[PDB]
Write an enzyme that holds these catalytic residues in place. Structure first.
Site, PDB file in Angstrom:
ATOM      1  CE  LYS B  72      -3.363  -0.348   2.854  1.00 52.47           C
ATOM      2  NZ  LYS B  72      -2.524  -1.008   3.887  1.00 52.47           N
ATOM      3  CB  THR B  74       5.338   0.538  -1.750  1.00 59.03           C
ATOM      4  OG1 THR B  74       6.578   0.670  -1.047  1.00 59.03           O
ATOM      5  CG2 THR B  74       5.628   0.026  -3.156  1.00 59.03           C
ATOM      6  NE  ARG B  95      -1.620   5.225   7.821  1.00 57.18           N
ATOM      7  CZ  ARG B  95      -1.739   3.911   8.030  1.00 57.18           C
ATOM      8  NH1 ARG B  95      -2.283   3.469   9.168  1.00 57.18           N
ATOM      9  NH2 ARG B  95      -1.330   3.028   7.106  1.00 57.18           N
ATOM     10  CE  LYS B 106      14.453  -4.169   9.937  1.00 56.39           C
ATOM     11  NZ  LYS B 106      14.930  -3.121   9.002  1.00 56.39           N
ATOM     12  CB  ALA B 274      -6.495   0.938  10.640  1.00 56.42           C
ATOM     13  CG  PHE B 302      -5.804  -2.615   9.436  1.00 55.48           C
ATOM     14  CD1 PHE B 302      -4.465  -3.024   9.565  1.00 55.48           C
ATOM     15  CD2 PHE B 302      -6.527  -2.321  10.594  1.00 55.48           C
ATOM     16  CE1 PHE B 302      -3.855  -3.105  10.803  1.00 55.48           C
ATOM     17  CE2 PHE B 302      -5.933  -2.412  11.852  1.00 55.48           C
ATOM     18  CZ  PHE B 302      -4.594  -2.808  11.945  1.00 55.48           C
ATOM     19  CG  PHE B 382       6.698 -10.178  -5.113  1.00 51.97           C
ATOM     20  CD1 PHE B 382       6.102  -9.045  -4.541  1.00 51.97           C
ATOM     21  CD2 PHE B 382       7.678 -10.879  -4.410  1.00 51.97           C
ATOM     22  CE1 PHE B 382       6.485  -8.616  -3.277  1.00 51.97           C
ATOM     23  CE2 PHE B 382       8.066 -10.458  -3.146  1.00 51.97           C
ATOM     24  CZ  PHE B 382       7.469  -9.323  -2.578  1.00 51.97           C
ATOM     25  CD1 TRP B 410       9.850  -1.838  -2.593  1.00 53.04           C
ATOM     26  CD2 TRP B 410      10.919  -3.173  -4.086  1.00 53.04           C
ATOM     27  NE1 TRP B 410      10.928  -2.382  -1.954  1.00 53.04           N
ATOM     28  CE2 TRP B 410      11.616  -3.189  -2.789  1.00 53.04           C
ATOM     29  CE3 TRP B 410      11.422  -3.937  -5.134  1.00 53.04           C
ATOM     30  CZ2 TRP B 410      12.766  -3.949  -2.581  1.00 53.04           C
ATOM     31  CZ3 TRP B 410      12.580  -4.704  -4.914  1.00 53.04           C
ATOM     32  CH2 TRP B 410      13.232  -4.709  -3.670  1.00 53.04           C
TER      33      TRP B 410
END
Ligand SMILES: Nc1ncnc2c1ncn2[C@@H]1O[C@H](COP(=O)(O)OP(=O)(O)O)[C@@H](O)[C@H]1O
Ligand SMILES: Nc1ncnc2c1ncn2[C@@H]1O[C@H](COP(=O)(O)OP(=O)(O)O)[C@@H](O)[C@H]1O
Lengths: 557, 557, 140
Positions: B72, B74, B95, B106, B274, B302, B382, B410
């Site tokens: 998202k 990204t 945000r 992380k 969220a 979310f 991907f 990405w």
């Protein structure tokens, strides 16, 4: 008519700190603004200038404090403004106030009168976020402690012996003692702990005696969080926490360039506890201002018995600083009180009281004397000190053989500080200072405390409770014997008797408890329960604070 | 081939924000710098552009989250960057992340690869100190509640009914359940309470839903902390904390200008949960963007069922926004998890499970439909997706009436989003939206909840526990019945059972508890067990985090 | 402990006498050597479960009840002493006694057999009373 501190700092006229940065020869890639009027000076400044010789180091201290109030910041900043009015390349280094008082008792001027540092609002609110990072680094460590317990407690820590508490920069008595870790196998290990005001964080202390960042990082690593089951101490470093703590400090370690109403460069950086800690702005801010000005006005907490003593004994010792002059402040009012005059009797002129009160000041002067530092009395004057008193006092300092001056920086600005500035100069030119540390590292802890207690407070000696001796036995044995000594005791008297005003003699100092700040690198004799977390009044400032559509603030000052 | 996230965040040249500022028609007297690459923009800007037309609002959302990661933030950045390439005057609103994660689980980028808002480090850490302000204002209220107790408890709050917890922006489990107020009459009133991570704070939610300062002040006043022994509510208004809290948020209220890797201007402001909250950046940030640019991309926490739905039913409602388009992010990967395929074998082509999983995405498209907003799917490419799988994803997407673009943002940055950008633009030119919220505020709490559950989640019906029925009746009788509904449920299923992946059918939702955010202005039904305070892992990232003299950071990203 | 129970209930039932929970001097007792009970926090769980406060247990023979048993002249005297027992103080610092909570009759009733001395004997059958058993430091 004198308008209120706030109205003053408001009607005042600030200069982009970037130009002041400039005028001190701070490179623009070393400034890091926060609006047109505050900034963080990179540490790179000092480290490129580490050899260029230091300016002259001037400490502002004072007489033992009183309900009458001494004006040690007012007059530490006014002196600064006179020295600029004389074309001296001079700064003032100062401490950042906690946020907490703002919402409880009230927000205060970084000084007062025509001797403020600005912007006053920012200083009293989040400022540059310095204290938010302390808080967050302290509490991340605690977090990491409790978590380490949760994860099987590999280091075999007894949760009940955890000396590492939590911090928050609000006067919240409800957090003085709490139990955490409740609600089962998933939520940690119940234990008793609590919260102290963040400025009393040992992290706050380290901030202020760290040399560079990598010194702060390593001081962090040394901190005692608490002991294992066999009595073996555990550290921040054992928890491998020192990294992240340093990381959260990356920007707060940089000192904060503000200024005076008269546009003289001020640093504001650090703001530790003066009783359970050393009481000075950071070393970074001073050692930098030293390589940037020829004169650096700075100060320390409480009277000279505590601030000055530790200024010399801990800060200077750590930083290799060799102070030069030292002002000692006083009022005919603060002195009348030390002659058994209740705060309502400060109204009537009292020639007789002022004589006996003097005993307080004389004692200080001798004690400053004791460091190989050129004293100068300064006299903050008050609207109803009839000249009768002034000369009578004026007499007594000379009659006591040290230099004296009227100080009118409150009411008149850098102008009212010219007299005193000059004597500081007379003194700087003609009076060298062979500063020596009042003691030696290798002395036993009690020896050290004896020294200070006997030489500075003027006591016939020290007495030690059962636990206090037991604790010192524990530390000498742990190797923490080498360190300096920070004297957790009242300020309102040379003694621990908060009411023994003046120079009381025949008394002894009694040491009730002994805490360790391995990270800050000192040791804290306690001679009376220490208020590490104030609480809000019956009606907090908060209740009366407000801001409208226009951004107009009321109730903050 | 593609570097690491941190490598990328340091290579790319940032432009002084003041330029980006000016580039948007922002006057110098409206920008306060935080260094060169950060700025708070004045609320005066929105006011001086009150009457310009709004750019197009584009919401980025996703299919149901997995532990796999979704795509998202990204896409939001990547889409934004492609539009800037396409010549469009575009901003992205995002945000601010909590400090917490950075030390436990992380710290990842605000985006990733070549689709990142920066400066990374400062965004992830203290940023411009917004979260600190949120933290401190929330706890000042807390402090004020307890003080109220201690000072004679005039308002007669039953300590035990207190709903206002405390906050800290760390992952600290040990603080979830605590007892405070211990030590004697000098130390407050013993009571049970705990901490939530700072971004879960209603203060955060009010920050994100407020129209300006005086509104944020008002919401604050309406915040309910607890109840009198009589069950009557006691708000922050009642304790006169709103001005203080407001004052503490005076810089926190302005959105923070920053930028993407390609220097596209970018707001970061606000950062709520969220589940118990609406999980959107602030109205202030979003509504200013819509003035300074013709295209605003923003996003919601979310899956579409949660963030999108709350973005429309809460945010857009409060603000009178009308989404012009909406992007749903899907990955071949996750769509297969929804078709049964465990995390371990997601690389293996499996068209049949991909066909089953699409149900998840199909349901979401249908749901965006129900708001009147034209959908566009963005397939986050991907390397291990097969051509066959992708083609199958486009087939179903069109067979379901949704335009679809592959998105290699990405890896390729703005360029990997041109196809998407153009599809979004095609949708804006040709399918103007018919935006409406899902539900009218008239409906009862149970009706509003049903309508979300049935229309959006695909649920059969809704159950309550007795506790939920008591709360709903309390909230209704106290007159909060005509409030919006913010559904705290699991994110990993349409259901309230986190294991029920894909497009579950014949299920019922259970509402166990109902809390109230009277200041934020909504009602929070809870379905699962809701974690308002994450905790640290076995070996926290803080142990692996260091910084050396060169300033070099390791183990933080 | 009935007295204790009655104090806390008093709190829970609207605290009419206005005891500041935190000034409560009346602890609880158990005739076991239980260190873990010396310092406790009770009253937790919600409004349904009493008023959270700090307190602890003392071994039963340290109980003022024991001391009153040993100093009383008979039952009605033991009842009177009971009534005069101070448990805590109003927020105003005024004392609140067991009299004030009307516990003396109950307590008395609970001591109706406890009040009589217990006849027993030595190895040589010399008659012997055993009765009462207080601490010699905080009691006589
Ligand atoms: N000469 C004076 N007349 C009236 N008020 C003063 C004077 N000097 C200082 N003050 C006020 O009283 C306070 C005491 O001065 P300050 O330097 O802040 O004390 P210290 O630094 O010793 O705590 C200041 O906040 C200032 O507003
Ligand atoms: N196509 C992709 N290839 C590799 N990594 C990706 C791709 N898309 C997203 N990511 C990574 O996933 C992480 C988290 O997901 P993100 O892109 O933020 O989506 P969401 O907002 O749905 O969680 C990011 O830090 C980013 O580096």
């Amino acid at each position: 008519k004198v308008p209120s501190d706030i109205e003053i700092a408001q009607a005042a006229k600030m200069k982009p700190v970037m130009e002041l940065a400039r005028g001190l020869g701070i490179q623009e890639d070393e400034v890091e603004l926060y609006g047109k009027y505050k900034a963080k000076i990179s540490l790179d400044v000092y480290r490129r200038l580490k050899d260029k010789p230091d300016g002259k180091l001037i400490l502002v201290t004072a007489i033992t404090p009183t309900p009458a109030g001494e004006g040690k910041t007012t007059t530490s900043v006014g002196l600064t403004d006179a020295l600029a009015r004389l074309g001296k390349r001079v700064m003032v280094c100062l401490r950042e106030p906690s946020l907490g008082p703002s919402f409880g008792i009230k927000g205060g001027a970084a000084g007062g009168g025509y001797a403020q540092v600005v912007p006053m609002e920012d200083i009293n609110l989040h400022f540059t976020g310095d204290i938010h990072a302390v808080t967050y680094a302290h509490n991340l460590l605690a977090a990491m402690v409790d978590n380490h317990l949760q994860q099987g407690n590999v280091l075999n820590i007894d949760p009940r012996t955890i000396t590492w508490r939590r911090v928050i920069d609000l006067n919240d008595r409800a957090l003085r003692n709490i139990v955490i870790g409740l609600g089962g196998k998933a939520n940690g290990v119940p234990r008793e702990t609590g919260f102290d005001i963040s400025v009393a964080s040992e992290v706050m202390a380290c901030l202020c005696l760290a040399s560079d960042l990598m010194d702060l990082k390593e001081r962090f690593s040394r901190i005692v969080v608490g002991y294992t089951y066999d009595g073996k101490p555990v550290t921040a470093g054992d928890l491998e926490a020192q990294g992240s703590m340093a990381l959260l400090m990356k920007d707060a370690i940089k000192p904060n360039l503000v200024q005076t109403l008269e546009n003289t460069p001020a640093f504001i950086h650090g703001g530790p506890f003066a009783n359970i800690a050393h009481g000075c702005n950071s070393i970074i801010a001073t050692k930098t201002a030293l390589k940037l000005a020829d004169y650096v006005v700075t100060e320390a907490g409480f009277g000279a018995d505590l601030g000055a003593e530790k200024f010399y004994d801990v800060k200077c010792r750590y930083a290799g600083f060799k102070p030069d002059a030292t002002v000692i402040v006083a009022t005919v009012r603060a002195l009348k009180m030390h002659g058994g005059v209740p705060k309502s009797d400060l109204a009537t002129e009292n020639l007789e009281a002022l004589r006996e009160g003097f005993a307080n000041l004389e004692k200080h002067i001798e004690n400053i004397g004791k460091f190989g530092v050129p004293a100068v009395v300064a006299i903050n004057a008050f609207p109803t000190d009839t000249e009768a008193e002034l000369n009578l006092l004026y007499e007594l300092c000379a009659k006591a053989g040290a230099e004296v001056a009227l100080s009118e920086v409150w009411a008149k600005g850098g102008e009212g500080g010219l007299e005193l500035a000059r004597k500081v100069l007379q003194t700087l030119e003609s009076r060298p200072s062979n500063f020596h540390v009042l003691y030696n590292l290798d002395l036993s802890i009690k020896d050290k405390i004896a020294k200070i207690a006997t030489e500075i407070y003027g006591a016939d000696g020290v007495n030690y409770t059962a636990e206090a001796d037991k604790a010192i036995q524990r530390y000498e044995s742990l190797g923490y014997g080498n360190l300096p000594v920070v004297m957790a005791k009242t300020q309102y008297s040379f003694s621990d008797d908060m009411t023994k005003l003046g120079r009381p003699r025949n008394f002894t100092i009694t040491v009730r408890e002994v805490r360790l700040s391995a990270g800050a690198g000192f040791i804290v004799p306690i001679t009376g329960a220490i208020m590490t977390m104030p609480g809000l009044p019956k009606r907090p400032a908060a209740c009366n604070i407000d801001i409208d559509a226009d951004g107009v603030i009321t109730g903050l000052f």
